[PDB]
Structures are given as C-alpha cells and as structure tokens.
Amino acid sequence: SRKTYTLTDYLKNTYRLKLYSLRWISDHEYLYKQENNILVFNAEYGNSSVFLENSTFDEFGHSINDYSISPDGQFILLEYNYVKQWRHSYTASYDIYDLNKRQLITEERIPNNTQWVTWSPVGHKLAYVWNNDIYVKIEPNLPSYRITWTGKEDIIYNGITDWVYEEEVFSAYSALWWSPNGTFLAYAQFNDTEVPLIEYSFYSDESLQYPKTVRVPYPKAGAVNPTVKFFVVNTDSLSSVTNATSIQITAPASMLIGDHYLCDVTWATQERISLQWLRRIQNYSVMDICDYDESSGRWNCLVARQHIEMSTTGWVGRFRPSEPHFTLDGNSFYKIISNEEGYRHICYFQIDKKDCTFITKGTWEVIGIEALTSDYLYYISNEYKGMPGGRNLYKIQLSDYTKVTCLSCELNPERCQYYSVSFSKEAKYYQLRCSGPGLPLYTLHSSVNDKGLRVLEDNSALDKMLQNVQMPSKKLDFIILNETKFWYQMILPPHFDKSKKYPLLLDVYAGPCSQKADTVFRLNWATYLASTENIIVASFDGRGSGYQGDKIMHAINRRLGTFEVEDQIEAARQFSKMGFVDNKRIAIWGWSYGGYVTSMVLGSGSGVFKCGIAVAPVSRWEYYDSVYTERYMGLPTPEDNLDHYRNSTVMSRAENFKQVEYLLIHGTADDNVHFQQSAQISKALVDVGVDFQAMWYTDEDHGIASSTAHQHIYTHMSHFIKQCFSLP
Amino acid sequence: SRKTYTLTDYLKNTYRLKLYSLRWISDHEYLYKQENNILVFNAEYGNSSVFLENSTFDEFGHSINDYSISPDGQFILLEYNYVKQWRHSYTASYDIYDLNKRQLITEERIPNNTQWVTWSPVGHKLAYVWNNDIYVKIEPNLPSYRITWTGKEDIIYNGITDWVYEEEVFSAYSALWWSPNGTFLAYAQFNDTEVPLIEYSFYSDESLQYPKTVRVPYPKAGAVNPTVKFFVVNTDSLSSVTNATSIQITAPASMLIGDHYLCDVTWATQERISLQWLRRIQNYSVMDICDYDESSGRWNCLVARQHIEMSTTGWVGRFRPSEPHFTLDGNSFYKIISNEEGYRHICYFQIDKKDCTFITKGTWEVIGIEALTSDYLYYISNEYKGMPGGRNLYKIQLSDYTKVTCLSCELNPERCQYYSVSFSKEAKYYQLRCSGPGLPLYTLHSSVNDKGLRVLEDNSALDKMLQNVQMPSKKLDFIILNETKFWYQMILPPHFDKSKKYPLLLDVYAGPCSQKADTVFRLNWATYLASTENIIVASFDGRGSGYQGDKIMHAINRRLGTFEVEDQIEAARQFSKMGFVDNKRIAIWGWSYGGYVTSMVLGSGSGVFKCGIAVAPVSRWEYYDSVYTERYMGLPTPEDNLDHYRNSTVMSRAENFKQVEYLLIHGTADDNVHFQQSAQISKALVDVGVDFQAMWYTDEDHGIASSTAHQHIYTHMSHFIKQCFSLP
Amino acid sequence: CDFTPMLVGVPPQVYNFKRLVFNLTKLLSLFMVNEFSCNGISPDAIARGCYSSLTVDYFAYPLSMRSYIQPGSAGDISLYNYKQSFANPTCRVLATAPANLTLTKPSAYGYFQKCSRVSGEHNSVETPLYINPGEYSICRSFSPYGFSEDGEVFRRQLTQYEGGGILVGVGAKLAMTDKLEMGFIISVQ
Numbered sequence A, B: 001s002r003k004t005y006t007l008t009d010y011l012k013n014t015y016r017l018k019l020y021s022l023r024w025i026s027d028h029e030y031l032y033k034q035e036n037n038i039l040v041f042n043a044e045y046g047n048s049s050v051f052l053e054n055s056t057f058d059e060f061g062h063s064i065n066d067y068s069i070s071p072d073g074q075f076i077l078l079e080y081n082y083v084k085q086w087r088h089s090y091t092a093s094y095d096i097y098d099l100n101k102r103q104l105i106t107e108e109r110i111p112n113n114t115q116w117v118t119w120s121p122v123g124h125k126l127a128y129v130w131n132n133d134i135y136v137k138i139e140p141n142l143p144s145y146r147i148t149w150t151g152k153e154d155i156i157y158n159g160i161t162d163w164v165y166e167e168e169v170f171s172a173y174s175a176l177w178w179s180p181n182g183t184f185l186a187y188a189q190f191n192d193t194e195v196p197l198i199e200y201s202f203y204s205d206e207s208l209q210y211p212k213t214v215r216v217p218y219p220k221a222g223a224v225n226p227t228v229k230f231f232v233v234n235t236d237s238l239s240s241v242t243n244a245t246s247i248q249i250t251a252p253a254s255m256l257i258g259d260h261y262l263c264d265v266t267w268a269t270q271e272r273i274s275l276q277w278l279r280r281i282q283n284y285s286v287m288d289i290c291d292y293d294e295s296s297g298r299w300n301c302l303v304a305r306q307h308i309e310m311s312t313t314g315w316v317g318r319f320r321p322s323e324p325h326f327t328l329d330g331n332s333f334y335k336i337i338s339n340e341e342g343y344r345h346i347c348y349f350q351i352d353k354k355d356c357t358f359i360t361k362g363t364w365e366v367i368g369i370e371a372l373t374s375d376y377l378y379y380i381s382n383e384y385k386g387m388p389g390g391r392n393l394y395k396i397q398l399s400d401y402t403k404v405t406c407l408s409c410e411l412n413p414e415r416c417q418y419y420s421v422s423f424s425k426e427a428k429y430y431q432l433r434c435s436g437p438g439l440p441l442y443t444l445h446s447s448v449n450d451k452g453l454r455v456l457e458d459n460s461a462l463d464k465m466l467q468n469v470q471m472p473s474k475k476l477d478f479i480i481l482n483e484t485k486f487w488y489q490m491i492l493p494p495h496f497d498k499s500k501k502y503p504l505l506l507d508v509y510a511g512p513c514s515q516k517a518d519t520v521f522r523l524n525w526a527t528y529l530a531s532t533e534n535i536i537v538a539s540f541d542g543r544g545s546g547y548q549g550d551k552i553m554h555a556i557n558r559r560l561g562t563f564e565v566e567d568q569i570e571a572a573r574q575f576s577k578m579g580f581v582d583n584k585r586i587a588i589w590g591w592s593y594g595g596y597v598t599s600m601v602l603g604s605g606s607g608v609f610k611c612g613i614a615v616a617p618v619s620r621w622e623y624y625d626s627v628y629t630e631r632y633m634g635l636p637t638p639e640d641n642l643d644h645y646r647n648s649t650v651m652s653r654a655e656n657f658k659q660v661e662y663l664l665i666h667g668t669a670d671d672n673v674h675f676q677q678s679a680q681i682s683k684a685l686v687d688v689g690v691d692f693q694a695m696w697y698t699d700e701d702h703g704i705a706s707s708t709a710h711q712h713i714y715t716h717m718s719h720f721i722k723q724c725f726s727l728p
Numbered sequence C: 001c002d003f004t005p006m007l008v009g010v011p012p013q014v015y016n017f018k019r020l021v022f023n024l025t026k027l028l029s030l031f032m033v034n035e036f037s038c039n040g041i042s043p044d045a046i047a048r049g050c051y052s053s054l055t056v057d058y059f060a061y062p063l064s065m066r067s068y069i070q071p072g073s074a075g076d077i078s079l080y081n082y083k084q085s086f087a088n089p090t091c092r093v094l095a096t097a098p099a100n101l102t103l104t105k106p107s108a109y110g111y112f113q114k115c116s117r118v119s120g121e122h123n124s125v126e127t128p129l130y131i132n133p134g135e136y137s138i139c140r141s142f143s144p145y146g147f148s149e150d151g152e153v154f155r156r157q158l159t160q161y162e163g164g165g166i167l168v169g170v171g172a173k174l175a176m177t178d179k180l181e182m183g184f185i186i187s188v189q
C-alpha cells in the first residue's frame, strides 16, 4: 500500500531535518548562512542584509570548510585544507580576508597545518597553535609573536590538549582561554613523556605496500597519566625584541600531593580567573580563584578563595565538575552542585565565603545555566510534568527566588517538550530550539517581555513529505522496580495492535549518566525497523542513569557491569510480560559501552535474549583509558578495586555464549575503544568453542562513519536482525 | 543407516592412520620409537633391542620434546622448553646425556634459547647457534669455541636463516653444512640491514594491557633483499687462545654484478663443496665447485668448473634449482634438469666439462634422486601408467642406461600408486612408504635382490574400523582442453549415482608447480563433506601445475592470476556438463594461493559459482615477499612488469562480488600472508557496496593450526557451506 | 737521494703501491728487517752513483701475508695486486717499522681477492684480469686507500680501450698490527 521508512531512506538520507544555525554577532544581530552566503538578520523585525556574497567565496582556488568572523566585524577567517585527526582535533590552512578593504591579507600569513586558531572576544587579536606552540598576532597583517618554545610532537602540548584530555576532560582540542577583553591569554601545557603509547596498524590507501603503525600516547586504567601546568601571558606587553614571559599559576597544596587534573578554566573578570582542579581519585575537587597583581605582574591565589566539592557516595559532577557563572563584578557566582538529597541544583556562592545558598530545590535536576543577567538567571531543567527526559527553559528572579516562570512550557505543548537555547550577547534575544515529540521547531524571542517574535524554521516540508509514508510512534512511560520509577521508550510500529505480538529489539547504552529514554524526534535505524520490519525498538533507563538524582546515578560506583546489566535484563522481562512482545524473538544491541552491556547480557545466561550485536565494545576495563575508567571503578590495584576489575569482564563469561547468536563488529583503526578489546573477545569465544559472527572495518574509527562504511555496517546488522527474527 | 565420517570425527581425529618413522643409524640398523622407548632394529632379521628405556626420561624435571643420536651412538641430545617462531624456526633448551656412562653432562651445558643444534656426520662434534652466533664443541664436556662475533638480532644471522630464506629459498632454519667427516664447517651469513620491516600487533594473553608490535624484516615485491655471504671454518684447528679463522667463498662474478641468492650447498668430497647461486631475475643459475688448497688453507673455485643453468621460457627449477648428487670420487654428479621437450630428467655431468648427457628420456618427469651407489641410481618418477599423480621407485644401471627396473610398480597394484623411499646408510636396505589409493603401507626391502623382508605397518586396525563407516570414494581422470590432457580428482559421496544431481565444491590451490589431483589417501574436511553432506569435492590441475612438463607449468610465467583462474572456471563448466553435478549449487574454496584464486574466480563475473571461501588469501602481489613473487612475475617496475602487477588484483574486481556469497578469513598474527591483504580486500568490498562475511582469528598465523582455532574455522566453514547449499 | 717522502705520512696499500725512481741505503737501519731476498744482484752490494737508475716501490704490507709474495706464488696478491718483475735485479725487504717514527698507521691492511670482467650473452662469460709484473691493477680505482669492513664488492661498466664489459672487484681487509709492517722492492739499473 503506502510507502514506509526504508533502509535506503535512512542510508541515503531522503528525509532531511532542516536546522536554523545562527551565530549571534551582537546583542541584536546574528549571522545566517543560506544559499551559500552569509546574511545579517536584525532580531527585532527581520531586516536581512547580505554580509558576504557567493562570488567572494569563488575567488580563492581551494574550497572553504568553515569561516570565523572577527568580533569587530572587520576580518574573516577562512579555513580550508581540513584534515581530521580525532573526535575534536584537526589541522587546516587559514586565510584572513579584510572586510573593509575587500582583499586577502597575503603578508605574514598563518602557517599550514595549524592545529587551532581563535579570535579574541573583542577586537581582532589572533592566537593560533602551530607545531604544539602558541603564536599571537596583534594585527592580522603584522608578524606573530611566539609565546611558547617547548612544544614537542607527542610530548609537550601548548595551547592544545592531548588525547585523554580532549576525549574525557575538556571535550575539546583547545586549551586557550582569552581574557574577557582580550588582554591576557591563559593556556595549559600538557606533558605526556611517561605516558605509554598504543600502537595499531593503519593499512592506508592500496598503493601503500607497507602498513603504517600509529602510536598514540594513551593512559590505560592505572597507567601514568599526563601532567599539566597552567600559564597566563600578557598580550599587551608583547615585544618583538624580547621573548614573552608567562606567569605560572600552580595547583593548590591539597592537589599537588598526588596526581591531579585541570578540569575547568573560567574568567571571572578582566583581572580574575577561576580554575577547577580534580584529583585522580575523582571524588575531590577544588576551585581556585586568582587575582592579577598589578605591581608584581603575578597572579596571587588566596586560600580563603578556595571552594571544595566532595562526593562521599561517588564521583564529583556528572562527567566533570560544573562550570561557574560569575556576576558582572566577579565577587559571586552561581554553580550547579548536588544537594543533600542528591539532586543537582543551582547554589549561590560568594568568592570569599565557604557556605553556599541553594536557590532551587525539588525532586528534579537543573541541566545547565544558560544566561545570567543582573536581574535574572536562565536555566534548563526537567521539572515539568516530572519527566526526566524533557527539557524546558526557566527564569528566576535574583531578588526573589520564589518567583520562577517557565518560558517554554506552554508554547506548543504537544509538539515541543525538549528545548535548547541560544541567547544574545546581552541576553535580550534568544532562540529556542525544540526537538520534542513533534518535528524540530526554531523560534526567536525577546527577553524583555518573553514574547514570540517569529518562527525561524518549522519543518513544514518534511511534514508534507511524511504524510505519505507510514511512520512509527514513540511511547514514553515508566515501570516500578523497587518503589522507584525507571523510564523507558518504545518505537511502536505503524498500526500497532495490543493483541498482536511483535519481536523486540533492545537499544542499549546504559552508561553512567545517560538517557536513552527522552522526548526527541529522530530518523534513524529504529524508524526503519519499526516502520518496515514491524519490530518494536525499546530503550531503558535503569541504575546508573542520569538526570534523576544521585541515588540512581551513583548506584554503579566501583561496580561497573553489574547493576545496569541486571536492569536491562529485568526490563526485557517486564517488556515480555507486558503482553504484546514475542518471548521467542527478543534481541539486544549497543555501541561502545552499549556493546559492553550487550556482551555481558548475552553472557549472563538468562535466556531472555535470542541474539545480540556489539559494535566496538569494551571487553575489559583495564584496556580503556584511565580518566573514564577510574572515575567510576577506581584504581586497578590489589589495595582498592582489582577484584572487580577482574570480575567485570566479557571474556570470563564466554561459556554462556553457546545459547545466543552473536555479531561482533569493530574498526581496526579505533583509538577510543581499541581493536584489542574485540580481539580478546573473539579469542576467548574461539577458545571456548562458541559459534559467532564477526566483521572488522579497515581504517575505521570509533564511530564507523564514512558513507560506504556506515551504509555497509547498517545493511549488515539489518541482515543479521532479519535472519534472527526469520523476517522475509 | 550406518555411521558416516562426521565433522567431530575429523576435528577430534577419531580415525588415525599409523606411521612407521625410523632413523637409519647404520647400513643395517635403525631406531624406532614405541611405548615411549627407543628400540634399535636389525633390518636383516627384524629383532630389536632396547636402546633407551622408559625410566631414563623420567629423571629429568622437564618434558623432552625431541632426541638426537650421535653417529657413534655415545650421546643423546635432549631438547626441551620448545618455543616455536616460524614454519621451520624455533628455540629450545638442550642437555647432553652420556649413554656409556649413563649420566647427564652438567659441565659447560648448551645455553638456553639455542636457535639450532646439529651433530657432525661422524663422531660427536656439535655446532649450535646462540644469539645469532655459531659455537662449536669438539667434545660435549669441553667448552665451546665462538666461531662468529658479528651476530645481531634482526640484522646479522650466522648459521641460521632470515625469514625470506627460511620460507622460500631453503625451507629450513639451519644454514650450517658439516664436512662429510666433520673436519670443516660451512655456514652462510645473512644481512638484513636495509630490509624493510612488517609491523603487526600481537594482543597476547588477556593480562597484557598494551598489545605488542612484532617487527619482522620482510622484503616485499621489489623491496631491498637480504645480503648473503658464505664462509668455511676448519674445526680441526680450533684453539682456546686464538679466534677462529673463517675463509670466505665469494659468488661468481656473474652474480656479483647485481642482487643474487644462495640456493644450495652440497659437499662433494672431504675437501670439495658445490654452491648454487641464483639471480634475483630467477631464470639464471650457476653452480660453483670449489676445492681446498692445503698450502694456503683457502678454497678456490675454478671458472672451468662452473655450470650454467638458465631458463628461457620461465624460471630455473620447480621452486629452486635441484641438488647435485656426486659420485664417490667427486669428479661427476647427477642432476635433474629440464630437457629440450621440457621434461625434467636426470642428466649426467662431469665436473670440468660443460656438456651433460641425459640418462632418462620421456613425456614424464623425474621427481627426485633418492640414492646413488655404484652401478645403480635410484629415483622417483611418474612414468608408470601416464599418471602424473602417481609416484614409483625406479633404479637404473650406470653401466647400461637401457636397463631400468621399477622396484614398486607391481608390488601391490590396486592399493599402492604413490611411493616414497628412505635408504640405509650404504643404500643396502630401503623402506618403501606407500600412501596410495588404499591405506598407507610400510615395507622393508633389501636392495641386493629387491626382495621384501617384512611389512612394517599395515594399518590393519584402521581398516577394521573403517568397515562400519560409509566412506567416500575418489575418482582420478582427465579432460581434454585444446588437445591437452588435464587431470582432476573427485571425492564422491557413498552410494554415488550418476543419475542423481549433487552439489559440487571446488577445492583449489592452483599455485605454480602444484598437484591437487593425485592418488593419495586422505582423511580431511572433504571426506566429511562427501560422506555426511553428500557433496562432490573436486580438484583440478590446470595450466601452471607441475610434474607435467614445462609447457604446462611455464604458461603461468609473468601472468599470475590469468590462466589458472580461467582453467578453474572451465573445469567447473566441464564438471557441470558431466551430468551428475547440480549447476545451481557450485562453490569454490581455497587457502593462501588458493584463496587468491578463489577471490579472482568470484570476481570474474562468470556466474558459474554460487559462493566461495577464501582463507588467508593473497590480494595484491606487491604485498607478498620478493623471492616468491619475482620468481613468477618479476620486478614491479614500469620497465619490467608493473602493469600485470596492477591488473591482477582482487580489488579491481570488487564490483563483480555482488553476484556471489563471500567468506573471507584471516589470522591477525599472520607473517606469511599478512592481514593487510584481507584488510584491503574488505576495504574494497565495502566501498563498492558488497555484503560479505568475514572472520579474523586473533594471534593466529598462516596455518591457524592451534586446536581450538582449527576446530572453530572448520566448523564455521562447514556452517557456511551448509547454508550456501541449503543443506537441511 | 732523499728517502724522506716514503717515510712521511700514511703509507699506501699493496695494490696502490707508489714508485719512486732515482746510493745511501742507510735507511735500512731505521726499521727492523725480516726478508732481504733477491733474484739478481745479491744484497749489501751498492754501487752508489754508478747505478744508471734506482726505483723503489713501497706499500703497507702485513708480515702474515709473506708466502703470497715470492719468486713464484699462486695467490690473490700476485694475481691482482702486485707481482714482482725479474727483468731487472730486485730485492724484497718486508721490514717492520718501529714506533716513534713519522709514520701514521693505516686504518687496516687491504688487498683484492678477485677482480674479473663480465661480458656474454646474458652476462655469462667471466674473465679474470691477471696483472702484469710491471703494471698496476685495473681494479685499483675501487677504494685506493683501502676497504672498510671485509668482502666489499665493487662494480663498474668498463668503457672501450678497456674491453667494454663489467668490471667486478672484491676486496679483503686484515686488521692492523701493533706496529706498522711495510714492504719494499729495490731494482737497480
């Protein structure tokens, strides 16, 4: 009859989700790139104007990957020759184009293979990292001043992170922090000398007759971790004749007694910077607030201006300690910390004093602080309807904490329940981006009266296009396990019948502080499986999941692969007990941590699941990196936690794999979860005598994301699933 | 019905053939191992005595792997702590036990991790290689003498071969050649300084946090080859106060003008050695006969005594030039070389005369020379019945070449057509080892009258066991292609009916100078398939195969991947035309070179084959070692043969794989056919969109010979074949 | 005349011997001698200026390489490095220089064990190139100052007026002795 969401539709991306990506250049203007040229929009009443034209982009011979606009609007930074390295890191060539003279700046150019470039928040100061060294350009045409001279490849990193910091700590390649008005440039230096390297073979293009070995400094669980130093340089004193001087800011005395991390850098004022330090045993953190001393030229860090965050029941933060949001004068700040009951909420701090006053409370969590103003604070929370999966924007008076108003709860209640926000420079205009149960909707608002200005994008065309096709429906509900609610989502096939019985596939991540059950509209592999193959795809949020308090998230502390596995198995049992699930046909699949949970579920010997797919799975926690593993498990030493490091392993349970059908997939050039982990799973399975299926992917990273590789892997897993359920 | 040959019968090895492995320690005596004892036997009368007892082995704390006999019989050499490295190379610990005194020798023992140990041909002199250096013990209790001082790991090899030599040139790890009575020790020194290294990862046991990288100097096609030198040392002049003097013998100037190999070392008399050198273009070879001058203590090779062996239509030899067989005086020798027609025959040489005379003629080939006494020469050939896959023992009279007598043609005609022999020390008694169409049979004969003494092994227990098993049958016949007979073999299911149609699996190797159609009894995977699954397993000998003349064998020259593939396809077409073969269910499988031919056949787009399995296949000929590849293809340079090197890849044919089902298997720790080849095949197949099945085997070499991995791979391949043929 | 030049500097190898043509013979007292044999005029017979000519060829030469230089020898030295000429009366010396002399030792002793020419249908015919009693070696141009390590192989494409093939030379190295041994020949005319 009618068309359905097919695999080609997912792989070829026939149905496109339109987005409205804008960059707020000013308090009431933003840049939008439509029809391959940048336009300026007035936030009040439309009033669009052309900023750059397509012909200008046609001028230079090479293709432009990305552009960056100087805050004064006089220069643009054109990025080309893009070459990706890791999830957040790359190298590229950059060209500077004058917007007033309308010409290229050909003298004293930024060198090729530049690792990172950034503008100052005001003016047109330019700082970039080249060969692990920092250079600062006061003007785009004048020569650059070299800041650091100790940059060494794979040894010393200046202004950029190493692998582990970029992956787990900062979630970014940049370790540069400009001052609020561009006077000081703070940077971190990472030393990876004694950090051991992971080596894997890179079978490059077919013309290469000898494979290359990629050596990456990678601290595994319990190994030497990279070491860090923090420096602040003064860019107004830079002179050509002399070398620049960098003033080092040391970690607190309570933090130098062992291994530590630098987890956050924030500028409080033009002469005040806050640093957060985290111990290797990541249940202790200290915030250091330091003030510039004009006579000395040095930065003084007072002991009385130190704030300590502790966690008796687990780790500090969700993945890291949260960032502070200082006031205009810089004498106080707002931070999201866990309350006495375990729910993260905004607490009001004063830099001099230890005690903090909580301004929000309840059985819900604050997701983040969005904007701070003299009169109001804006934040995202899941308070509405008591659903942990939803997100909404709120505002709270700073003179009266009782008056709290929801700015997005009733705008379109049915279609939008998952909100995100972008605020202008002075926070008088914001864009609300919903991606709730309905199609994504983008709107513009003004903060003065919280009135709706216009609709930037409503995804009308997809709605027109999706009327012909047969779409599945998402149901979000909860179950009671032990006097507590755990939320699940199910992708029900079209014309779902409660009397009929369907196969069930469990989509699993089940990592610490994760949410696989939310109100987000997605067009993915589950849409195909529900729309075309009539398979129910279900996800569960059990113990160790986030955004529902610390009693649930910290339940898997030092015990990884124990409670989440049993929670997934019990969820599958409850789903089969619900009534419309075929007990003979139940499957489970996951990626990364989800692959680990899938493997442990299959090796548990419960008999609930018929088959499973693990994609790039973690097999042993001693093979994974130190920061992530030691956040949740501790150190792999006989003193504290070696016993559970040995117990929680997929290999140990290889004898229970006889009762299931297993698909094991891994990319050979994976740097996050190395191929060694699957290679050990397969070796254990072969040693026991288990029949299973495997597939490697040459030169493929953690996310097996090419065109051909992505299409191939999803076609292969669709074939496996159709063979499992005996589908036509 | 009755029992059949099952998969567990093959994997657990339920039915086992028995062997009679003996070591002739004398003209009339040999040693045999039974009931964990060492029994010496009298060949003339058959009585035995206990050479070594049970309780002698039990006094050592270690488990003895192998034993060695001094030619005088005074010392045993017991090998333990075995550690395998490559196909022929290993390290072990050795201890010497005196047989007269009945005690272990604890003074100046052979060091641990000894690479190679050998006795002298007479007496009890020992030469062993430790840390790439040669040591000589005149007596087992006295200290050893260091011969060479230049040994270095992965750089310089003294007395032992490097990977490419051990794999392709010598098929052995030793590079030591004792003089006929042990006065001289000749050895080769290899130099791998500029040879590139192949790097692959070795995961090891699960307790290892970081995988190891294995660096093996491996010269690929066109890369830098190792350098070889040859030295002879006089072991009768060794002293404890002076370093040993080694006299170098240089290659002929016809090889010193470029790259070359050392192919063979053979001692003619006590003071004469023969050396065979081959050019990197392996169609030119020179034998150098050198003599020892007692005045100078130097070895001199005359120009007049050099013998040229060149090939115009291909390469020299079957794989390497054949070994010479000198007479007692050392002034003449017999060699198997190709005649004008193209058939390998024994030619009679004089050391100083260039012309040699052929003593055998025919449209058949001599396989090898087995013994050379006065008035009689013993050799193995496939002359009998015109069957290229049979082997029979013949003797020719040196006084009259017209008197040729077959010593094994009419011994047991139905049961025995494939013969191997082992002669005594003076060729007075020979053991005839048969492995023909029937069960293997071992008999002892005396060469004075060619009379049979006794039957050493009858395999009567296996014959009794196999009467209750439905066993498969083998048919050996030929087909005519362009007025040329090409032979094939067929493992037929029990109760074979020509009227019924059977699925056909084509087992292929098709390498140059290969024979897959012979009269050899086997119990392998094809027995199970034919006995249990009723699948016809066929092998075909096409163009490029051996033991049929140079016209058939050299058709593959410089055109690898062209004629063998077409011959396999045409053989499949003929088989389907025979009338008892299901045309829809035809499959092809192979290992190593057979995997390459299978992949080429599947990418040919012929439509004959439904599916196929490639195990450790060659993908690109530039990824393989230089010696093997350049024997058949030449250098990969634009002047010589790069275009075929580019046209004969499995990758180029990735588009045609959409019409077949593919199973691709490799072991990650493979050092012969690296995992890079299968990785490149899989990468090409993902790019074009082809769905296939893959399986990697962690830590497994080319053989995949570990018991668990062997069982796993054959179970997986049986599952795949059953699925392809829709077998219930 | 003056025999200072032979003494100064580093002495040359046997295959690259240096000849001075000019009396005295006091210099034999400078270093220890070992072999004064002659085939023509006997030793200790000097005519001073009455000699029409005086030629000397000198070279660093180990004493272990002694039997290979004789009135009749069959070895690498005579065949490819230096063969004595008996048309004029000569005298071998083979003396050993002492310490504290103005003689810088060579790094090692060197000589050529093979030097032949390759030219044929497929580079098949090998022709050893034996030197004349009075001539130099064709293979001299390969490392005139000696070889590093042992068993070096040198090759070059010979041009016309030399044969037009491929010249192959193999050299041998012997480590230097504690004191420098050298060789002389004195031919009187």
Ligand SMILES: *[C@@H]1O[C@H](CO)[C@@H](O[C@@H]2O[C@H](CO)[C@@H](O[C@@H]3O[C@H](CO)[C@@H](O)[C@H](O[C@H]4O[C@H](CO)[C@@H](O)[C@H](O)[C@@H]4O[C@H]4O[C@H](CO)[C@@H](O)[C@H](O)[C@@H]4O)[C@@H]3O)[C@H](O)[C@H]2NC(C)=O)[C@H](O)[C@H]1NC(C)=O
Pocket: B150, B156, B191, B192, B193, B194, B227, C107, C142, C143, C144, C145, C146, C147, C148, C149, C152
């Ligand atoms: C295993 O194989 C490797 C690689 O093939 C071998 O290593 C090579 O060894 C050779 C030595 O034969 C070496 O070549 C020398 O390198 C020196 C440093 O680069 C050069 O200085 C030297 O040239 C001089 O010597 C030549 C004679 O050998 C002369 O012909 C030449 O003109 C140069 O003359 C200098 O020296 C003389 C004194 O001898 C002096 O009077 C002159 O004024 C002048 O100064 C050689 O080219 C290679 O470089 C090595 N290759 C490497 C290391 O990669 C290794 O030896 C082999 N191992 C074994 C055990 O055989």
Ligand SMILES: *[C@@H]1O[C@H](CO)[C@@H](O[C@@H]2O[C@H](CO)[C@@H](O)[C@H](O)[C@H]2NC(C)=O)[C@H](O)[C@H]1NC(C)=O
Pocket: A150, A156, A191, A192, A193, A194
């Ligand atoms: C990076 O770290 C290494 C080691 O952690 C530092 O090297 C040490 O330098 C000190 C000098 O102060 C020596 O005493 C140590 O012996 C060195 N250790 C090692 C292992 O080399 C190195 O100086 C650091 N680099 C930077 C730029 O800080």
Ligand SMILES: *[C@@H]1O[C@H](CO)[C@@H](O[C@@H]2O[C@H](CO)[C@@H](O)[C@H](O)[C@H]2NC(C)=O)[C@H](O)[C@H]1NC(C)=O
Pocket: A149, A241, A242, A243
């Ligand atoms: C700035 O510092 C760098 C490195 O500390 C100086 O560069 C060194 O200069 C010395 C002396 O000229 C050289 O011996 C080194 O080789 C240089 N090192 C490098 C990495 O370049 C540089 O001279 C300093 N500049 C000024 C103006 O003092």
Ligand SMILES: *[C@@H]1O[C@H](CO)[C@@H](O[C@@H]2O[C@H](CO)[C@@H](O)[C@H](O)[C@H]2NC(C)=O)[C@H](O)[C@H]1NC(C)=O
Pocket: A181, A182, A183, A236, A270, A271
């Ligand atoms: C950016 O901020 C810095 C820090 O407040 C300013 O630098 C100070 O400026 C005042 C007034 O000009 C001087 O008295 C101080 O000596 C300066 N201190 C330092 C460390 O430079 C700077 O002027 C600001 N720039 C702009 C454009 O506002």
Ligand SMILES: *[C@@H]1O[C@H](CO)[C@@H](O[C@@H]2O[C@H](CO)[C@@H](O)[C@H](O)[C@H]2NC(C)=O)[C@H](O)[C@H]1NC(C)=O
Pocket: A281, A283, A284, A310, A311, A312, A313, A639, A640
């Ligand atoms: C952070 O975690 C560590 C490890 O769990 C805690 O150290 C433990 O402290 C208790 C109480 O003093 C001891 O009984 C344990 O023996 C300690 N374990 C180890 C491995 O040393 C530490 O107390 C925690 N810190 C905070 C602030 O909660």
Ligand SMILES: *[C@@H]1O[C@H](CO)[C@@H](O[C@@H]2O[C@H](CO)[C@@H](O)[C@H](O)[C@H]2NC(C)=O)[C@H](O)[C@H]1NC(C)=O
Pocket: B149, B241, B242, B243
């Ligand atoms: C035999 O040769 C070896 C190496 O060629 C000699 O060992 C060397 O001896 C010298 C001086 O005693 C040392 O400086 C070297 O370090 C030694 N090398 C090695 C590799 O050991 C040994 O002395 C020689 N033996 C005799 C008797 O001459």
Ligand SMILES: *[C@@H]1O[C@H](CO)[C@@H](O[C@@H]2O[C@H](CO)[C@@H](O)[C@H](O)[C@H]2NC(C)=O)[C@H](O)[C@H]1NC(C)=O
Pocket: B181, B182, B183, B236, B270, B271, B294
């Ligand atoms: C092993 O063979 C060698 C080589 O023929 C024999 O050595 C020769 O023996 C004869 C007689 O004793 C001497 O005249 C020669 O000078 C020896 N040559 C060398 C190079 O040593 C040796 O005698 C044989 N050993 C046996 C037969 O036990």
Ligand SMILES: *[C@@H]1O[C@H](CO)[C@@H](O[C@@H]2O[C@H](CO)[C@@H](O)[C@H](O)[C@H]2NC(C)=O)[C@H](O)[C@H]1NC(C)=O
Pocket: B281, B283, B284, B310, B311, B312, B313, B639, B640, C122
């Ligand atoms: C060994 O094979 C090479 C390569 O095929 C032969 O070299 C060829 O010789 C013929 C005739 O002289 C020439 O026409 C070709 O151009 C040569 N090819 C190359 C690549 O040089 C060589 O002659 C053979 N050696 C024999 C037969 O002894």
Ligand SMILES: *[C@@H]1O[C@H](CO)[C@@H](O)[C@H](O)[C@H]1NC(C)=O
Pocket: A042, A047
């Ligand atoms: C649009 O904005 C420009 C400034 O960018 C302003 O000059 C103009 O008046 C605006 N148009 C209106 C208000 O209609």
Ligand SMILES: *[C@@H]1O[C@H](CO)[C@@H](O)[C@H](O)[C@H]1NC(C)=O
Pocket: A035, A036, A037, A054, A055
């Ligand atoms: C500018 O060029 C692009 C081509 O990349 C085109 O799509 C766009 O329509 C052009 N702009 C205008 C205003 O025509």
Ligand SMILES: *[C@@H]1O[C@H](CO)[C@@H](O)[C@H](O)[C@H]1NC(C)=O
Pocket: A093, A109, A110, A111, A112
């Ligand atoms: C970057 O590389 C290109 C191409 O080699 C070259 O033309 C250009 O000058 C380089 N840029 C710099 C800043 O050197």
Ligand SMILES: *[C@@H]1O[C@H](CO)[C@@H](O)[C@H](O)[C@H]1NC(C)=O
Pocket: A643, A644, A647
């Ligand atoms: C690991 O499992 C063993 C049983 O095999 C148990 O004795 C031990 O207590 C466990 N350790 C843990 C759960 O930390």
Ligand SMILES: *[C@@H]1O[C@H](CO)[C@@H](O)[C@H](O)[C@H]1NC(C)=O
Pocket: B035, B036, B037, B054
């Ligand atoms: C030697 O031991 C084996 C088993 O250990 C036994 O079968 C055999 O009979 C023993 N030999 C003798 C002569 O008894």
Ligand SMILES: *[C@@H]1O[C@H](CO)[C@@H](O)[C@H](O)[C@H]1NC(C)=O
Pocket: B040, B041, B042, B045, B047, B048, B049
């Ligand atoms: C076999 O018996 C004969 C006697 O006929 C004897 O000479 C020979 O040594 C015996 N062989 C063994 C191995 O005992």
Ligand SMILES: *[C@@H]1O[C@H](CO)[C@@H](O)[C@H](O)[C@H]1NC(C)=O
Pocket: B093, B109, B110, B111, B112
């Ligand atoms: C070999 O190793 C063992 C164990 O360390 C040791 O006892 C023995 O002495 C070694 N052998 C030699 C010859 O050193």
Ligand SMILES: *[C@@H]1O[C@H](CO)[C@@H](O)[C@H](O)[C@H]1NC(C)=O
Pocket: B643, B644, B646, B647
């Ligand atoms: C092999 O491919 C090359 C590349 O185009 C071509 O020049 C050559 O003719 C091809 N060889 C054959 C036999 O088709």
